[PDB]
Design a protein around this ligand. Structure first.
Ligand SMILES: [Mg+2]
Ligand SMILES: [Mg+2]
Lengths: 476, 483
C-alpha cells in the first residue's frame, strides 16, 4: 500500500520495532510467499532464497523483494530476522550464517502469529478442506466490506493471490497441523473441519497425539473464543467435551447448531438449506460442487453469523465464490477432434487432493452434477511415505472411476519403498504411465465422446495439468 | 471512560465478545482491584467478593461495582466469567458454584494477559522490587504524555490508585512469579529485576525450576521484543546465554549496557549517573532512597530509552517520583513529649519488605539517609515456611537495627511449624549479643512497647507484609501516643 494508506494502517496495526528487513529461506515453499507478500505491502524490506523459481517468486519480485536462486551465507546479510520453511534443514548455509551473525531465526508459523498479534485472527484448521474454507471465509468478509488480510495455502481465484493485506482488523488464515506449527497461532475464532490420519510422521503413528494437538490448538483461544467444528466427523463429535471453549457445531447431523439439509448438486453448484439458531432457514446457492463444500460453506457461515455479518453479504459471496487454485479447478471443455478424431467434448478438472478422502470427494462431486459422463483420472500419488500406510484405502477409492491413468509416485525426497510403487497399485482395469513428456498420447486411445478428465494429486502433476490445457489436448 | 472515549479505544483494543459481567473472587487485594478498575472504566459490569472492606473495595463501589463481603454460591450468579486471585482456595464456594454453572473460571494472570493482548505490554518481573519499578516505568510514560494503562501491586501515590486505564496502547504491569502465573503474559518488553529463592513451594523446592520458569517467561517475548535484566545479579548473569531474545543489561557492573555510577544517597534522595550507548552520561536525581532503587530506576530508564522517550521527561519523572504505598513509606515525624515525656522526635516509615534482601535494603536505606538516628524496627515475619527456609538470613539482617520489636508470625493461611517462631528467631538474635529483641505478643499493645525504647532522635521502620500495615497506620493517627 502507498505511504498515506500505510500511515493509516499504522494507527491501528503497529510495526515490529527495529524490524527493517525480513529474509525467507525457501520463499517459494508452502505458505511462505503469502506471508512475504503481506509483509512487502506493509512496507518491510523483503528478501528470499529458493532453488526453484515459480509464479510466487515472480509475484514477490514485482512487489520489490530481492530473490536469490541459491543458498549462500551472503543471502542473509543485513536481515533483521530469518524465516525458514519446514523443508529447510538445520545445515543450510543461510541458517548457519544467521546464527553466526546472531540474527533471530524463526519458523513460518511464528511469523504468521506475529501478523495475528494486533489483528482479529480467524484460524482455519483441519485435515482436509482448509484452503477452500479459508477462501470462503475471506470471500464473505470481503463482501461484507470488512477488507480482511488473508493468508491461504492456495491461490484465491477472485484475488489472483495466495495472500493479501487489507485495511481491516481481520486476519483469515489457513492453520497447518502437518508439523504441529499452528500451535503458535493465537486466534479469536478457530475452525476445525475434520481430523484424520495424515502427516503421522510428526505424531509418531499415534492418532491420539493428533487429537490432543488439535485440542491444545483450540486451547489457544481466549476464554471467550469460539471453536467452529464439524460434528459429522465422529472424532470431532467425541472430542467436543474436551473443548474448554464455546463451540458451534455444523454438519448434516440433526443436533448440529448449524445444520445442512435439502442438499442437491446441479452441475458445478450446490443448493442447500442452513438452519441457524434464532434465524429463518437460509436457502444457499453455492458456487462449488459436492456436499463436502456444503460443509465448508456452513463453517464459513457459522463464523460470519457469529461476527454479525449481514445475510445478503453471506449469500452474495457464496453464490459467486470463485474457488482456489487446483481445488476442483475447471480448466476448460475441449472438442474431441484434433485429438482422437471423434465428436463431442472432453472436460479438464484439476485437483490438489492427495489423500483418499479428498480423492473420494472429487469423484463424488464429478458423478453428481455430471452423471452421464466418462470419468477419466490422471493420478500422481504423493510420497512412498504415504502410499504404504494407506495402501488399502487408495485402491478401494480409486476404483470408483470409469477409466484411470497413473503416474509414478512423486518423491519429494523419501527413498522409494518397494511395493509402495505405482506399478504395485495399478493391478490391485488400471493403466500406468512412465513417460511424463507424452501424456496426451497416453490419454488419446481412452477418450469417448462425453468425458470428464480429472487430474489428481499434489506433486508436479499440476505442471502437467496446465500443459494439457495449453495444448487443448493436441498430442503433438 | 465516557461513551466516545471508549469508542476510540475500541478502534485499537476490542471488547471481549459476549463478556458482560466479570466477577472477581478476592477483589480486595493482589493486583485484583486494579484489573477490576481498568475493566470498570472499560464499561464492563463488575462484581467481586472479599472478607473485609478496604480502600480498594470502596473505589470499586464508587465506580459502580457490586461487592459481597462473604464467599457464597450466589455471589457468582449471572457472571460471564469468574476471576480468582492466588489467595483463593480451589474449593471456595464461589469457584465450585462457577464450575457448577458452567461459567469459565480463570486466574488473575489470564485476565491480566487479556488486558495485554491487544496492547503493547511491558511486564516487570523478578523476586523483589517489582512494585517500585513498574511505578517508575508508568511515571516516565505518563510524564511523556503516552497515557499508559497500568496495573501495579501497590498504590501508585501520584495517581492515588493501584491501576488506571489510559487512552494509549501501552500496558505496564507487575508480573507475578510466586505462583508461576506470569507465564500467561505475552509482553513486548520484560524487566527482570532479580532472581532469588522465595515462594519455593511452588517450584518444588528446586531453584533450577525457578530459573527455567524465568527463561520460559522471557521466551514469551516475540523475536523483536526486549529483555531488560539486572546483571549485578549473579543468577541473572549466569542465565543470559539461555535467554535467546534481545536483552539489554543494567547495573553497577562494568559490562552493563545501562551502567549506574557515582551513587550517593542524600536523605530520602538518590544521586547517580547513568551511562547509555550513543548517549551522554545522564545525571539523575531520584526521589527514592537506596542503591536498590537506583537499579530499579535504571531498569525503567533502559525501557524508556528503548521506547525513545525524551530524556527530559525521564528526568522529570524520576525527580518528582512519589513512590508507592508501603514502600519505604514516610508516615510522619512525631514529637516525643506526649508519648514518653522525652524531648525530640521519632520518624515513622512503613515498608512491605518481607524477604531478608528487602528488609536489608530498607535498613541500608535508613542508615545511609539518616546515619545518626536511633534505628528501631517493628517486624512481623510472613509465613512459617519462609521463616524456616530463610531463618539464618533473617537473623543476619534483623540484628543490624539498634532496637528490634517482633510480632508473632503472620501465617497467611499456613499451619504453625515448630522452630520457625518469632520467639525462636528472637533467641537466635539475642545469642549474637548485639541487640536484645522485644517480643510483642499482643498486636494492639504495640505503642505500649514502643514508647520506652524511643530515645529522642529515632527512625521507626514498621516492616512486614499485611497485618502490620494496619499497625503502621494506627501508629500514625495516634501519633505514637503510648495508649
Ligand atoms: Mg495436509
Ligand atoms: Mg514475592
Amino acid at each position: 500500500m502507498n505511504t498515506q494508506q500505510l500511515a493509516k494502517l499504522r494507527s491501528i496495526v503497529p510495526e515490529m520495532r527495529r524490524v527493517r528487513h525480513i529474509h525467507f529461506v525457501g520463499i517459494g515453499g508452502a505458505g511462505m510467499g503469502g506471508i512475504a507478500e503481506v509483509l512487502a505491502n506493509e512496507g518491510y524490506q523483503i528478501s528470499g532464497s529458493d532453488l526453484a523459481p515459480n509464479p510466487v517468486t515472480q509475484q514477490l519480485m514485482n512487489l520489490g523483494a530481492t530473490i536469490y536462486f541459491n543458498h549462500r551465507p551472503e543471502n542473509v546479510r543485513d536481515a533483521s530476522v530469518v524465516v525458514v520453511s519446514s523443508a529447510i534443514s538445520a545445515d543450510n548455509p543461510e541458517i548457519v550464517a544467521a546464527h553466526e551473525a546472531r540474527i533471530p531465526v524463526i519458523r513460518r508459523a511464528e511469523m504468521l502469529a506475529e501478523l495475528m498479534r494486533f489483528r482479529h485472527g480467524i484460524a482455519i484448521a483441519g485435515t482436509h478442506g482448509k484452503t477452500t474454507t479459508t477462501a470462503m471465509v475471506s470471500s464473505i468478509y470481503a463482501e461484507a466490506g470488512l477488507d480482511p488480510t488473508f493468508v491461504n495455502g492456495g491461490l484465491v481465484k477472485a484475488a489472483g493471490v495466495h495472500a493479501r493485506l487489507g485495511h481491516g482488523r481481520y486476519l483469515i488464515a489457513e492453520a497447518d497441523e502437518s508439523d504441529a506449527s499452528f500451535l503458535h497461532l493465537q486466534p479469536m475464532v478457530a475452525i476445525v473441519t475434520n481430523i484424520e490420519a495424515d502427516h503421522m510422521d510428526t505424531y509418531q503413528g499415534d492418532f491420539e497425539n493428533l487429537k490432543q494437538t488439535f485440542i491444545n490448538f483450540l486451547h489457544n483461544l481466549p476464554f471467550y473464543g469460539r471453536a467452529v467444528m464439524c460434528v459429522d466427523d465422529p472424532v470431532i463429535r467425541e472430542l467436543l467435551p474436551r473443548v474448554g471453549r464455546q463451540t458451534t457445531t455444523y454438519g448434516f447431523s440433526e443436533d448440529a447448531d448449524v445444520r445442512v439439509e435439502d442438499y442437491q448438486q446441479i452441475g458445478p453448484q450446490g443448493h442447500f438449506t442452513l438452519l441457524r439458531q434464532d434465524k429463518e432457514p437460509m436457502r444457499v446457492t453455492l458456487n462449488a460442487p459436492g456436499r463436502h463444500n456444503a460443509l465448508n460453506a456452513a463453517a464459513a457461515v457459522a463464523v460470519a453469523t457469529e461476527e454479525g455479518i449481514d445475510d445478503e453479504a453471506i449469500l452474495r459471496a457464496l453464490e459467486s465464490f470463485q474457488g482456489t487454485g487446483r481445488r476442483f479447478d475447471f480448466l476448460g471443455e475441449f472438442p474431441l477432434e484434433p485429438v482422437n478424431g471423434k465428436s463431442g467434448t472432453a472436460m479438464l478438472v484439476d485437483d490438489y487432493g492427495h489423500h483418499p478422502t479428498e480423492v473420494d470427494a472429487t469423484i463424488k462431486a464429478a458423478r453428481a452434477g455430471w452423471p452421464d459422463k466418462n470419468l477419466v483420472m490422471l493420478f500422481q500419488p504423493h510420497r512412498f511415505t504415504r502410499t504404504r500406510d494407506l495402501y488399502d484405502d487408495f485402491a478401494n477409492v480409486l476404483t470408483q472411476v470409469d477409466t484411470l491413468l497413473m503416474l509414478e509416485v512423486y518423491p519429494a525426497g523419501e527413498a522409494p519403498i518397494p511395493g509402495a510403487d505405482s506399478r504395485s497399485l495399478c493391478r490391485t482395469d488400471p493403466i500406468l504411465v512412465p513417460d511424463p513428456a507424452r501424456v496426451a498420447e497416453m490419454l488419446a486411445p481412452v477418450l469417448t465422446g462425453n468425458d470428464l478428465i480429472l487430474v489428481q494429486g499434489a506433486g508436479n502433476i499440476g505442471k502437467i495439468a496446465r500443459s494439457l490445457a495449453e495444448i487443448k489436448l493436441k498430442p503433438q
